[PDB]
Amino acid sequence: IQRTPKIQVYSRHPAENGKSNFLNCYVSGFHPSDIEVDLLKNGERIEKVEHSDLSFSKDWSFYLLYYTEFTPTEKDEYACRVNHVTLSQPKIVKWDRDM
């Protein structure tokens, strides 16, 4: 079977304009394990990105965590771009300081 990924974006700590934080893109619930993930800077890409080992939950679906160290500005709109076999076009999800 094939399962379309679920995407969540959030910071490690509460958003403090000017303080060094962490941006997380957590993709999960997908199959197969082939996936492409990117963290966007208002539309750009970060060459400095890291991720956890690819793992899977009890229902056998995969999950992965993509994170980038950073410092929140006051007017941008960060987002995560994910490409997977189950998506016609890459899915784009932005970061809401609230969630």
């Binding site: 079977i1 490690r12 957590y26 082939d34 679906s61």
Partner: protein, 256 residues
Amino acid sequence: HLSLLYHLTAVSSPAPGTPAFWVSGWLGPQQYLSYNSLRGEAEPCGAWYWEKETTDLRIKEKLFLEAFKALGGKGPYTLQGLLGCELGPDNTSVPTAKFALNGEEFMNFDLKQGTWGGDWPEALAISQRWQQQDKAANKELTFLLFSCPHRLREHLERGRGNLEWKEPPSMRLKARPSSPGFSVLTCSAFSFYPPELQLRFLRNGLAAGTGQGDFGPNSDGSFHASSSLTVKSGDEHHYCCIVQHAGLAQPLRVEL
């Protein structure tokens, strides 16, 4: 919690430079081990001799790749495995030996007759090949019945430190407008451990709902949660968010 689990994955058609086989080792909700075909060694993880592990997983690596051999047919195939045990109430260990093919459970290990079983033709094929591997099934049985509970008990001893870890969550409650005439209240929990957390909304002392909420990890092993609830504009200040977590001496109330 109080369980040792190895998550095994093998793919028949890996992308370039990618490994065909990799394993994650988990002690409860914490990853302590990592392994992959490329490196060929069992490495430690997040604040966690070792040979008995790098060997056990090397044998597993052979078996998973071997499963593609007599599955035949154009892939691509994804073979997954769940191996481990957990201390049960009565301090009794319960093993786990399940296998998935392309995301679907199709194989398991029967402790009764000591072999991998299943109805699918492909399970019959893989099971038969594995039986032909020198001492393979004996090792499986031995690990689920003896080695696993033992290693678990050891890591619990020499690693009680990271298990008693407690991080209270930093809370945040914000109100934002959505569809006309309504606002959405979002209650977020940041960087906490253990993973068991609970959020609930209250309305002027009244028990409100348990909103729609996600949950996820942070690069450091701690967690993140959030719960949203939709309310009529102007009714916001009437809500409180209650969080219950092992790292708090008592339920924390969060107001707007």
